[PDB]
């Protein structure tokens, strides 16, 4: 008699049978998190993070929407968090949005005709940029935080030349140096948090992610003028990880009817774990916004 193998596990150990899951086009489990109000859902709101980083960090923002009566979800993307694949690794960036549209595609079986909103943070922000531009007029909005529009130019101009290197010969190790944790938050018990959590990799960048990224930007600028889906866009000015730029290329090159941009002056890259006078605006913000948007 045949038996069933060892039940699958996350990188963590943890079987996947013992968490909510889901199995995207590869055949790889990814670990989702689900924020439902205790009533019928007003709207569906997909939570998108960020490189390195996984969706247990959005946990705040998370029950702040489902405090609005929104059904909030989210995965883990691919390579991250609790989710499978080699850490940091991705085969084309396209896998990060196709595992969104799957799973945005999954819950709007089980809530038919209600709206979907997409909140992504940098990496996460691009992802939610492709996945609109993707479906046109699917989604009703859009938040967006720190977005990856335009890379820091000095990192991006180091990345480049060290991007056509690796293209050039094989080179599979080859990575770039950690990310400085100092620059992500002013807020420096959130910069301790965020050294402290073992589901993030610290690890480099490794080369071949790093042209996914670069991907990504190239993708992000080619997708812009389809973009016409409502968005709010929340931006440090002081961001030595998504050039502040790229908000405002955003603005100018979205062709959306409905488009807000708030800048936070002196901020860092993760707006909702910034400073409480930034993190408590950010909260009030998206809160208006999404109200205004499903009320
Ligand atoms: O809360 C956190 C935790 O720490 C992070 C770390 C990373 C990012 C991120 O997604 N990118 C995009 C990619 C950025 C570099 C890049 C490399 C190559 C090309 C374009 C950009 C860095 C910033 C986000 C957070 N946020
Ligand atoms: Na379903």
Redesign the pocket.
């Known amino acids: 008699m045949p038996e069933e193998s060892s039940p699958r596990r996350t990188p963590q150990s943890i079987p996947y049978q013992d968490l909510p899951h889901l199995v995207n086009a590869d055949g790889q489990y990814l670990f989702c998190r689900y924020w439902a109000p205790t009533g019928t859902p007003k709207a569906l709101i997909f939570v998108s ?5 996984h969706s247990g ?1 959005y946990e705040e923002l998370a029950r702040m929407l489902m405090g609005l009566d929104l059904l909030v979800f989210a995965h883990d993307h691919v390579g991250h968090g609790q989710s499978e694949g080699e850490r940091m690794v991705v085969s084309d960036f396209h896998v990060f949005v196709r595992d969104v549209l799957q799973h945005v595609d999954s819950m709007q079986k089980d809530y038919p005709g209600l709206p979907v909103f997409l909140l992504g ?4 922000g ?1 992802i939610a940029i492709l996945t609109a531009a993707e479906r046109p007029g699917h989604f009703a909005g859009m938040v967006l935080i ?1 977005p ?1 529009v335009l ?2 130019p000095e ?2 101009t180091t ?1 480049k030349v060290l991007a056509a290197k690796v293209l050039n010969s094989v080179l599979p190790n080859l990575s770039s140096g950690p ?1 400085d ?1 100092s620059v ?1 938050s002013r807020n420096k018990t959130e910069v301790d948090i ?1 050294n402290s959590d073992p589901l ?1 990799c610290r690890a480099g ?1 490794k080369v071949c992610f ?1 042209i996914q ?2 991907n ?2 190239s993708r992000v600028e080619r997708a812009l003028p389809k973009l016409t889906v409502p968005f709010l866009l929340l931006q440090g000015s002081a961001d030595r ?2 050039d502040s730029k790229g908000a405002y290329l955003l603005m100018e090159l979205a062709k959306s009817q409905d488009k807000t941009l708030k800048i936070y002056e002196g901020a860092y ?2 707006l909702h ?1 910034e400073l409480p006078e930034v993190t408590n605006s950010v909260f009030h913000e998206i809160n208006m916004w999404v109200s205004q948007r499903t009320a």
């Open positions: 993070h960020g490189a390195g980083e960090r943070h940098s990496m996460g691009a720190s990856l890379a820091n990192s991006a990345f990310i944790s992500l965020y993030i960048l790093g990224l670069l990504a930007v990880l998504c890259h993760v774990k």
